[PDB]
RNA sequence: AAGGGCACCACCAGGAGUGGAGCCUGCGGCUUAAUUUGACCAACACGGGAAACCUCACCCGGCCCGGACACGGACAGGAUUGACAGAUUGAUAGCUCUUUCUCGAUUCCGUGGGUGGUGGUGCAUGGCCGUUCUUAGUUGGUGGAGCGAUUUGUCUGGUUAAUUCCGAUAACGAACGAGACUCUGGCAUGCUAACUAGUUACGCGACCCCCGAGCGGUCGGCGUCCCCCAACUUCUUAGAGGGACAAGUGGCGUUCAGCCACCCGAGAUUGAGCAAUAACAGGUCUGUGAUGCCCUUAGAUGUCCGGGGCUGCACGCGCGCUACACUGACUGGCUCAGCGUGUGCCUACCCUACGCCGGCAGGCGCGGGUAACCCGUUGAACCCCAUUCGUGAUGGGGAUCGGGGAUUGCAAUUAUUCCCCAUGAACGAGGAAUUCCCAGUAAGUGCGGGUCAUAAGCUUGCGUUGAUUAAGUCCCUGCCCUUUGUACACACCGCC
């Protein structure tokens, strides 16, 4: 990825790693009392963004943008 | 290996061989009820099995024409003497084969039959030989400058989606 | 016709060095993967070669 | 069209008769006034052509002139 | 005078052929052979060298 | 057309050693891939077998870029009387160990 | 010996490649030769984006032709001689094999 | 002609633009021997068409027959083929002339008959492709209406992306198309496994330390399949499976089809591919040893060679790129990708690490790689951090042009490309008009592939940063259905 995507992946990776380690070795009762704060702050801190990208079509410069057409 | 070629180029070269072999066999056995072909390639040898309707005609007198063909392929592609084999096998229920009917109707039209008569005969052959549906389109000009398209359809046909690849056979 | 000039002009390179392996045309030739095929010819023989338009 | 130059006439050979460039005297003596190109692949049967100031074998047996 | 300055026809449906038209006409009503149908149509060398060259 | 006698007899004896012969359609090919040491370009192969076909001695099949000349029976007899061969020599495709 | 060989499986249809990988592993267990799992190389994607039309006129329409090459490696090990122990191909058309020495 | 419906190739509200400048490139025109040529929503960065030769189809010159085969002549006392020298030609085309050799039935001539042609005809055709249209439309069986063609089914209405469904209903039940389907995207700490992907643990180190961290910190340093000398698949690869279905709730709705809101969930509309009955005298004979017919066929519209040309400019048009600046340019530093290619039957042409020389383009020797092994942990740009500039057509802009140097090629002039020092042109946000577009989308921003001996401003992909506006309508423009009119049925390019 890039700079932004790396940073976002890192911060969600930290939250997911701590919450999973806490759930693995100590009680999930106290895992919840930090998981609730994480999600109610930002759900992306625990749930990855499903959107990646859209393929380019042969009708324009990009995914949906189309080249200029002119009639005259 | 440096003497060897890349695997991607290898598969491309194989398909080139299959396409050219199919076209040459088509133009050679067009009248002999040609239907199709397959190849099994092993390090020991490569085998060519030609599927046709009339194998007794594809064979030469005491296999002369098959000997004729099995040499001319090796001479074309630089094959080993003992590692190229040529076989002819008949096609089961040829009424289901798009190519075999296409060649037969080609001969019938060369015979000069009425187009409606010839197409109805082959359509009847396919339908009574077992098929959910069959459809033949004949385009071109006859007895005039203007061209026409004749469509002879019965049964059921599909046109969209993946199933059209392994259900509807074209020629 | 005379041997000195019948093939004197080289074609070691360029567009005239390469031709389609089915029809000998020199326009719209695909050279990728060692194909060396006129493009209309390739669209004709793609199924036999093994190329499928998955999407 | 309208080509200004004229139709170039191709070379026509003389349709020469027998070779006869070597004779016999005193009731038969092999004598040649022609040269032989002595190249091994040229052979010993071939006779060099005679010219006013050079000698040229029928094959590519070089060409020796008088410098 | 039936075309524009380049040569594209000003009337595509004005059939320029005296024999045929925009439509295809079945000669003799689709009768006879070599024509479209009708309602009634509906109802060893190496060893030889070895012995030649030995002497 | 203009062919040396060694070239015609070498090409012909190749078409009788094996009943078939292929040839890439290239008049400018300096040497045929077969019979390279006879030093004859592919053009002489082209014109000779197309002249055999015109006479009625060989059947021509053409795929993408190669010829597929098939010797006929009249081609077999015509080659024998041209090369002075006895009525026992045959190509491989005609007979093999039988 | 102590001999070990790497058979490389390359194919264009996954179902056949998975089938050959199946009965070769099954043969390996039958000969009780220790075998590593078939490792899968990333699939090669041969793409040709040619134009659909044979002429110049059209709406600039393109055809995306694909060719998937799937590759696999199966490793056979044995403290005894191996090549004489297994002389079986068990192959079908559409898939090719090449066995190499693990040392070389 | 009327009524319904749909659509960012329509609008609304917005975004970025084009039209304004320079330049690349494509048409029309002008000139020329030629500036080869098709095409005028659905032509005009299209013919994968980025042409020095070739390509090449055009123009000026010059070779060859590569005119099979049949017949008649000429012929081993010669049918004939090449050829060093000199002229002659651009030519080392014996093309032609003087010159004699040499070749030896293979040819030469004449009569027919081939053949070839990027020659003409796409308004003679196949195939392919585009468009109407990728909108939702198309057809049987049985039954009803009819004397009949025919019609109902295929509909007032609600609904949906959709004759998609639900509903009234002389119709019931189907089939194509839509869907369904295949591929692709996101999730499985679930299974299967990997020295061509690796991860934790450990053993040596190297450095930081030592105030004391010492179960201290960094290591893309070395090892633990160097095979007995650790485990494992979380990360990578890719198979088999699962997973989402309007399933739960609430509200609206005939309470039906459905719509909206919310919890839980990875996902509550991921993109494509395919695609009906038919029509466009739509585009292609210049894709084809696809092709009918016509033209040409030895002074060749066959074919080769050489040179020019496809670029040529009083002008108009289209697609674009570079900018008009401080949200910036320059200088330096820090610094994270993903597609995917890579050594050739023809075919002589590969991606390249390291080291050295050069300022650069480059040059030299060793390597590696037919590839998850090497390039490559693809150290990309944008962006980020500091310095300078300072509203000045200025350190923006890099057009035009001069000089010099390298790579490729047989050949660089009409400049191939690239590098350096010069000059610094218009252009200060662009009229009437006009294009594209709803979420990782627009837009900026690089990198691959195709083209390639040399090379992208094109195209096709990939990734990075990443929003504003809307969840509606028929006002405009188009398209579809129903009704309506018809003297049209070759069907309005009609009839008259
Ligand atoms: Mg669908
Ligand atoms: Mg300058």
mmCIF file of C-alpha atoms (C1' of nucleotides) in Angstrom, chain H residues 47-304:
data_model
loop_
_atom_site.group_PDB
_atom_site.id
_atom_site.type_symbol
_atom_site.label_atom_id
_atom_site.label_comp_id
_atom_site.label_asym_id
_atom_site.label_seq_id
_atom_site.Cartn_x
_atom_site.Cartn_y
_atom_site.Cartn_z
ATOM 1 C "C1'" G H 47 -7.888 0.913 -39.778
ATOM 2 C "C1'" G H 48 -4.218 -2.197 -32.865
ATOM 3 C "C1'" G H 49 -1.920 2.994 -38.972
ATOM 4 C "C1'" A H 50 4.032 5.421 -32.771
ATOM 5 C "C1'" A H 51 5.538 4.801 -41.574
ATOM 6 C "C1'" A H 52 13.873 7.112 -42.657
ATOM 7 C "C1'" C H 53 14.555 1.131 -45.649
ATOM 8 C "C1'" C H 54 10.643 -2.630 -45.464
ATOM 9 C "C1'" U H 55 5.890 -1.877 -44.199
ATOM 10 C "C1'" C H 56 3.736 0.504 -49.172
ATOM 11 C "C1'" A H 57 -0.898 -0.195 -51.494
ATOM 12 C "C1'" C H 58 1.639 6.280 -54.289
ATOM 13 C "C1'" C H 59 5.613 8.715 -57.709
ATOM 14 C "C1'" C H 60 10.469 8.464 -60.723
ATOM 15 C "C1'" G H 61 13.988 4.926 -62.849
ATOM 16 C "C1'" G H 62 16.100 0.108 -63.366
ATOM 17 C "C1'" C H 63 16.302 -6.124 -62.725
ATOM 18 C "C1'" C H 64 13.802 -10.951 -62.904
ATOM 19 C "C1'" C H 65 9.679 -14.650 -64.617
ATOM 20 C "C1'" G H 66 8.857 -16.713 -59.821
ATOM 21 C "C1'" G H 67 4.285 -17.334 -67.825
ATOM 22 C "C1'" A H 68 2.788 -24.372 -64.705
ATOM 23 C "C1'" C H 69 1.181 -27.564 -68.462
ATOM 24 C "C1'" A H 70 -0.106 -29.313 -73.775
ATOM 25 C "C1'" C H 71 1.256 -28.936 -78.881
ATOM 26 C "C1'" G H 72 4.716 -27.140 -83.279
ATOM 27 C "C1'" G H 73 9.498 -25.519 -84.382
ATOM 28 C "C1'" A H 74 15.038 -24.818 -82.962
ATOM 29 C "C1'" C H 75 18.189 -28.266 -81.645
ATOM 30 C "C1'" A H 76 24.469 -32.570 -78.045
ATOM 31 C "C1'" G H 77 27.467 -30.627 -85.535
ATOM 32 C "C1'" G H 78 24.393 -26.894 -79.940
ATOM 33 C "C1'" A H 79 17.722 -25.544 -77.001
ATOM 34 C "C1'" U H 80 20.153 -22.578 -74.248
ATOM 35 C "C1'" U H 81 22.708 -20.316 -68.636
ATOM 36 C "C1'" G H 82 25.790 -17.275 -66.387
ATOM 37 C "C1'" A H 83 30.173 -14.505 -66.708
ATOM 38 C "C1'" C H 84 36.024 -11.384 -65.349
ATOM 39 C "C1'" A H 85 37.526 -6.984 -68.297
ATOM 40 C "C1'" G H 86 36.171 -1.886 -70.667
ATOM 41 C "C1'" A H 87 32.380 1.461 -71.795
ATOM 42 C "C1'" U H 88 26.801 2.319 -70.073
ATOM 43 C "C1'" U H 89 24.112 2.848 -65.732
ATOM 44 C "C1'" G H 90 23.205 5.403 -59.165
ATOM 45 C "C1'" A H 91 24.373 0.431 -58.951
ATOM 46 C "C1'" U H 92 29.878 -4.759 -58.215
ATOM 47 C "C1'" A H 93 21.195 -5.068 -62.492
ATOM 48 C "C1'" G H 94 26.614 -9.460 -68.194
ATOM 49 C "C1'" C H 95 20.188 -4.619 -67.987
ATOM 50 C "C1'" U H 96 22.542 -3.275 -72.743
ATOM 51 C "C1'" C H 97 27.047 -2.860 -76.059
ATOM 52 C "C1'" U H 98 32.784 -5.067 -77.728
ATOM 53 C "C1'" U H 99 34.774 -9.830 -75.995
ATOM 54 C "C1'" U H 100 35.311 -14.942 -76.162
ATOM 55 C "C1'" C H 101 34.738 -18.548 -72.767
ATOM 56 C "C1'" U H 102 31.441 -21.510 -69.917
ATOM 57 C "C1'" C H 103 26.987 -23.931 -69.220
ATOM 58 C "C1'" G H 104 24.318 -28.727 -71.843
ATOM 59 C "C1'" A H 105 18.149 -30.517 -72.630
ATOM 60 C "C1'" U H 106 16.966 -28.491 -67.103
ATOM 61 C "C1'" U H 107 15.617 -23.954 -71.277
ATOM 62 C "C1'" C H 108 14.248 -20.344 -76.097
ATOM 63 C "C1'" C H 109 10.305 -18.978 -79.570
ATOM 64 C "C1'" G H 110 5.078 -19.440 -81.326
ATOM 65 C "C1'" U H 111 -0.156 -21.118 -80.312
ATOM 66 C "C1'" G H 112 -3.631 -22.032 -76.034
ATOM 67 C "C1'" G H 113 -3.907 -22.228 -71.223
ATOM 68 C "C1'" G H 114 -2.267 -20.729 -66.275
ATOM 69 C "C1'" U H 115 -1.038 -17.780 -62.324
ATOM 70 C "C1'" G H 116 -0.462 -13.514 -59.366
ATOM 71 C "C1'" G H 117 -2.238 -8.901 -57.732
ATOM 72 C "C1'" U H 118 -2.660 -4.162 -50.455
ATOM 73 C "C1'" G H 119 -6.175 -3.831 -58.347
ATOM 74 C "C1'" G H 120 -12.082 -2.362 -58.743
ATOM 75 C "C1'" U H 121 -16.699 -3.750 -56.711
ATOM 76 C "C1'" G H 122 -18.579 -4.274 -48.865
ATOM 77 C "C1'" C H 123 -24.555 -1.692 -53.472
ATOM 78 C "C1'" A H 124 -22.367 -9.137 -55.609
ATOM 79 C "C1'" U H 125 -21.076 -12.314 -50.837
ATOM 80 C "C1'" G H 126 -19.299 -15.552 -46.307
ATOM 81 C "C1'" G H 127 -17.108 -14.699 -41.793
ATOM 82 C "C1'" C H 128 -16.124 -11.002 -38.202
ATOM 83 C "C1'" C H 129 -17.427 -6.419 -35.898
ATOM 84 C "C1'" G H 130 -20.450 -2.103 -34.682
ATOM 85 C "C1'" U H 131 -25.425 0.052 -33.859
ATOM 86 C "C1'" U H 132 -30.974 -0.083 -32.627
ATOM 87 C "C1'" C H 133 -29.544 -2.571 -27.447
ATOM 88 C "C1'" U H 134 -27.669 -4.685 -23.779
ATOM 89 C "C1'" U H 135 -32.974 -1.309 -23.556
ATOM 90 C "C1'" A H 136 -36.552 -5.240 -22.251
ATOM 91 C "C1'" G H 137 -38.447 -7.285 -25.492
ATOM 92 C "C1'" U H 138 -39.812 -12.289 -28.580
ATOM 93 C "C1'" U H 139 -42.593 -17.096 -29.549
ATOM 94 C "C1'" G H 140 -45.284 -22.105 -29.082
ATOM 95 C "C1'" G H 141 -49.164 -25.861 -26.784
ATOM 96 C "C1'" U H 142 -54.184 -26.157 -24.986
ATOM 97 C "C1'" G H 143 -58.487 -23.107 -24.436
ATOM 98 C "C1'" G H 144 -61.939 -18.481 -25.582
ATOM 99 C "C1'" A H 145 -63.139 -14.589 -29.562
ATOM 100 C "C1'" G H 146 -63.828 -14.773 -34.375
ATOM 101 C "C1'" C H 147 -66.012 -17.086 -41.715
ATOM 102 C "C1'" G H 148 -61.266 -15.488 -41.982
ATOM 103 C "C1'" A H 149 -56.370 -13.685 -41.882
ATOM 104 C "C1'" U H 150 -55.468 -12.843 -36.873
ATOM 105 C "C1'" U H 151 -56.339 -11.822 -31.608
ATOM 106 C "C1'" U H 152 -56.374 -12.919 -26.348
ATOM 107 C "C1'" G H 153 -52.650 -14.751 -23.450
ATOM 108 C "C1'" U H 154 -48.193 -10.360 -23.815
ATOM 109 C "C1'" C H 155 -53.128 -6.214 -18.991
ATOM 110 C "C1'" U H 156 -56.176 -0.702 -15.631
ATOM 111 C "C1'" G H 157 -52.691 -0.758 -11.467
ATOM 112 C "C1'" G H 158 -48.599 -1.567 -7.408
ATOM 113 C "C1'" U H 159 -43.640 -3.060 -7.680
ATOM 114 C "C1'" U H 160 -38.394 -3.948 -9.745
ATOM 115 C "C1'" A H 161 -32.533 -3.185 -12.682
ATOM 116 C "C1'" A H 162 -35.840 -5.809 -15.789
ATOM 117 C "C1'" U H 163 -43.850 -8.668 -19.732
ATOM 118 C "C1'" U H 164 -38.956 -8.700 -12.592
ATOM 119 C "C1'" C H 165 -42.841 -10.117 -9.862
ATOM 120 C "C1'" C H 166 -47.627 -9.266 -7.313
ATOM 121 C "C1'" G H 167 -52.095 -8.381 -8.517
ATOM 122 C "C1'" A H 168 -57.431 -7.660 -11.559
ATOM 123 C "C1'" U H 169 -58.102 -11.038 -15.479
ATOM 124 C "C1'" A H 170 -60.974 -15.957 -21.216
ATOM 125 C "C1'" A H 171 -57.377 -17.475 -20.116
ATOM 126 C "C1'" C H 172 -53.988 -21.904 -18.048
ATOM 127 C "C1'" G H 173 -49.387 -23.745 -18.529
ATOM 128 C "C1'" A H 174 -44.658 -22.949 -20.693
ATOM 129 C "C1'" A H 175 -39.827 -21.471 -23.625
ATOM 130 C "C1'" C H 176 -35.955 -17.500 -25.306
ATOM 131 C "C1'" G H 177 -34.079 -12.959 -23.455
ATOM 132 C "C1'" A H 178 -33.558 -10.434 -18.048
ATOM 133 C "C1'" G H 179 -32.353 -13.574 -14.373
ATOM 134 C "C1'" A H 180 -29.932 -17.808 -13.414
ATOM 135 C "C1'" C H 181 -24.682 -18.892 -15.042
ATOM 136 C "C1'" U H 182 -18.624 -18.251 -15.301
ATOM 137 C "C1'" C H 183 -14.667 -15.134 -13.722
ATOM 138 C "C1'" U H 184 -13.406 -11.396 -10.361
ATOM 139 C "C1'" G H 185 -13.515 -8.218 -4.971
ATOM 140 C "C1'" G H 186 -14.052 -8.353 0.259
ATOM 141 C "C1'" C H 187 -14.290 -12.709 5.327
ATOM 142 C "C1'" A H 188 -13.044 -16.840 7.421
ATOM 143 C "C1'" U H 189 -6.257 -17.069 13.485
ATOM 144 C "C1'" G H 190 -11.791 -23.075 10.145
ATOM 145 C "C1'" C H 191 -9.092 -27.867 6.720
ATOM 146 C "C1'" U H 192 -5.271 -28.990 3.326
ATOM 147 C "C1'" A H 193 0.221 -27.932 2.758
ATOM 148 C "C1'" A H 194 5.330 -25.265 1.061
ATOM 149 C "C1'" C H 195 13.906 -23.767 1.089
ATOM 150 C "C1'" U H 196 11.152 -21.077 -5.474
ATOM 151 C "C1'" A H 197 6.548 -17.800 0.571
ATOM 152 C "C1'" G H 198 7.566 -17.445 4.845
ATOM 153 C "C1'" U H 199 6.440 -16.396 10.533
ATOM 154 C "C1'" U H 200 7.693 -17.086 15.854
ATOM 155 C "C1'" A H 201 11.458 -19.598 18.952
ATOM 156 C "C1'" C H 202 16.649 -20.676 19.561
ATOM 157 C "C1'" G H 203 22.450 -20.775 18.634
ATOM 158 C "C1'" C H 204 26.364 -17.605 16.939
ATOM 159 C "C1'" G H 205 27.626 -12.979 16.056
ATOM 160 C "C1'" A H 206 27.969 -7.047 14.670
ATOM 161 C "C1'" C H 207 26.755 -2.525 17.015
ATOM 162 C "C1'" C H 208 24.192 0.370 20.895
ATOM 163 C "C1'" C H 209 25.184 0.002 25.438
ATOM 164 C "C1'" C H 210 26.939 0.018 30.064
ATOM 165 C "C1'" C H 211 23.683 4.860 34.597
ATOM 166 C "C1'" G H 212 22.088 -0.708 35.508
ATOM 167 C "C1'" A H 213 18.160 -1.838 31.559
ATOM 168 C "C1'" G H 214 20.613 -8.011 29.856
ATOM 169 C "C1'" C H 215 14.096 -12.513 29.450
ATOM 170 C "C1'" G H 216 17.860 -4.981 27.042
ATOM 171 C "C1'" G H 217 17.325 -2.905 21.791
ATOM 172 C "C1'" U H 218 18.477 -3.220 15.838
ATOM 173 C "C1'" C H 219 19.931 -6.449 11.954
ATOM 174 C "C1'" G H 220 16.372 -8.036 4.426
ATOM 175 C "C1'" G H 221 23.695 -10.121 9.482
ATOM 176 C "C1'" C H 222 24.796 -15.844 9.451
ATOM 177 C "C1'" G H 223 22.598 -20.580 10.667
ATOM 178 C "C1'" U H 224 18.467 -24.333 12.944
ATOM 179 C "C1'" C H 225 16.050 -29.651 4.456
ATOM 180 C "C1'" C H 226 24.082 -27.522 5.314
ATOM 181 C "C1'" C H 227 19.145 -32.537 6.305
ATOM 182 C "C1'" C H 228 18.639 -34.809 11.393
ATOM 183 C "C1'" C H 229 19.829 -29.619 12.776
ATOM 184 C "C1'" A H 230 12.934 -26.349 16.062
ATOM 185 C "C1'" A H 231 7.803 -25.938 15.652
ATOM 186 C "C1'" C H 232 3.731 -23.575 12.651
ATOM 187 C "C1'" U H 233 0.681 -21.642 8.412
ATOM 188 C "C1'" U H 234 -1.051 -15.848 11.505
ATOM 189 C "C1'" C H 235 1.254 -13.045 7.176
ATOM 190 C "C1'" U H 236 2.160 -15.272 0.932
ATOM 191 C "C1'" U H 237 0.520 -18.775 -2.533
ATOM 192 C "C1'" A H 238 -4.431 -21.916 -3.962
ATOM 193 C "C1'" G H 239 -7.458 -25.703 -3.726
ATOM 194 C "C1'" A H 240 -11.587 -27.920 -1.487
ATOM 195 C "C1'" G H 241 -15.485 -25.933 1.448
ATOM 196 C "C1'" G H 242 -18.386 -22.463 3.995
ATOM 197 C "C1'" G H 243 -20.555 -17.535 4.294
ATOM 198 C "C1'" A H 244 -25.905 -13.424 2.601
ATOM 199 C "C1'" C H 245 -30.766 -15.081 2.010
ATOM 200 C "C1'" A H 246 -34.185 -8.941 2.405
ATOM 201 C "C1'" A H 247 -32.320 -13.735 6.994
ATOM 202 C "C1'" G H 248 -33.728 -10.603 12.412
ATOM 203 C "C1'" U H 249 -36.480 -6.267 14.112
ATOM 204 C "C1'" G H 250 -39.643 -1.780 13.229
ATOM 205 C "C1'" G H 251 -42.543 1.094 9.914
ATOM 206 C "C1'" C H 252 -45.168 1.759 5.220
ATOM 207 C "C1'" G H 253 -47.811 -0.969 1.423
ATOM 208 C "C1'" U H 254 -54.240 -3.859 -1.097
ATOM 209 C "C1'" U H 255 -51.016 -5.875 3.824
ATOM 210 C "C1'" C H 256 -49.759 -9.137 -1.552
ATOM 211 C "C1'" A H 257 -45.459 -8.295 -4.453
ATOM 212 C "C1'" G H 258 -42.109 -5.159 -2.398
ATOM 213 C "C1'" C H 259 -39.836 -0.246 -0.216
ATOM 214 C "C1'" C H 260 -37.295 2.285 3.834
ATOM 215 C "C1'" A H 261 -34.814 2.496 8.862
ATOM 216 C "C1'" C H 262 -31.908 -0.119 12.462
ATOM 217 C "C1'" C H 263 -29.128 -4.202 15.420
ATOM 218 C "C1'" C H 264 -25.860 -8.197 14.343
ATOM 219 C "C1'" G H 265 -22.586 -9.099 10.405
ATOM 220 C "C1'" A H 266 -16.566 -9.241 6.268
ATOM 221 C "C1'" G H 267 -19.937 -8.241 2.962
ATOM 222 C "C1'" A H 268 -27.264 -5.668 3.238
ATOM 223 C "C1'" U H 269 -26.615 -3.174 -4.962
ATOM 224 C "C1'" U H 270 -18.226 -5.664 -6.266
ATOM 225 C "C1'" G H 271 -16.960 -5.207 -11.094
ATOM 226 C "C1'" A H 272 -17.027 -7.466 -15.605
ATOM 227 C "C1'" G H 273 -18.007 -11.768 -19.570
ATOM 228 C "C1'" C H 274 -22.022 -13.902 -22.240
ATOM 229 C "C1'" A H 275 -26.377 -12.254 -24.198
ATOM 230 C "C1'" A H 276 -33.197 -12.960 -27.662
ATOM 231 C "C1'" U H 277 -36.732 -12.512 -32.260
ATOM 232 C "C1'" A H 278 -34.828 -9.021 -36.059
ATOM 233 C "C1'" A H 279 -33.082 -4.638 -38.603
ATOM 234 C "C1'" C H 280 -29.343 -1.099 -40.279
ATOM 235 C "C1'" A H 281 -27.734 -2.146 -49.077
ATOM 236 C "C1'" G H 282 -23.859 0.061 -41.366
ATOM 237 C "C1'" G H 283 -17.726 -1.045 -41.610
ATOM 238 C "C1'" U H 284 -14.372 -4.282 -43.691
ATOM 239 C "C1'" C H 285 -12.289 -7.571 -51.091
ATOM 240 C "C1'" U H 286 -6.220 -3.163 -47.615
ATOM 241 C "C1'" G H 287 -6.492 -9.722 -42.186
ATOM 242 C "C1'" U H 288 -6.621 -14.480 -44.837
ATOM 243 C "C1'" G H 289 -3.938 -19.949 -49.960
ATOM 244 C "C1'" A H 290 -12.526 -16.473 -47.645
ATOM 245 C "C1'" U H 291 -14.693 -15.322 -52.250
ATOM 246 C "C1'" G H 292 -18.175 -14.410 -57.433
ATOM 247 C "C1'" C H 293 -17.561 -11.059 -61.339
ATOM 248 C "C1'" C H 294 -14.578 -7.386 -63.912
ATOM 249 C "C1'" C H 295 -9.402 -5.201 -64.896
ATOM 250 C "C1'" U H 296 -3.829 -6.313 -65.515
ATOM 251 C "C1'" U H 297 -0.559 -10.006 -66.803
ATOM 252 C "C1'" A H 298 6.034 -9.361 -69.871
ATOM 253 C "C1'" G H 299 7.238 -1.896 -71.587
ATOM 254 C "C1'" A H 300 3.426 -6.163 -65.402
ATOM 255 C "C1'" U H 301 -1.651 -2.768 -61.431
ATOM 256 C "C1'" G H 302 3.123 -9.940 -60.569
ATOM 257 C "C1'" U H 303 7.560 -9.302 -58.141
ATOM 258 C "C1'" C H 304 12.680 -7.083 -56.517
#
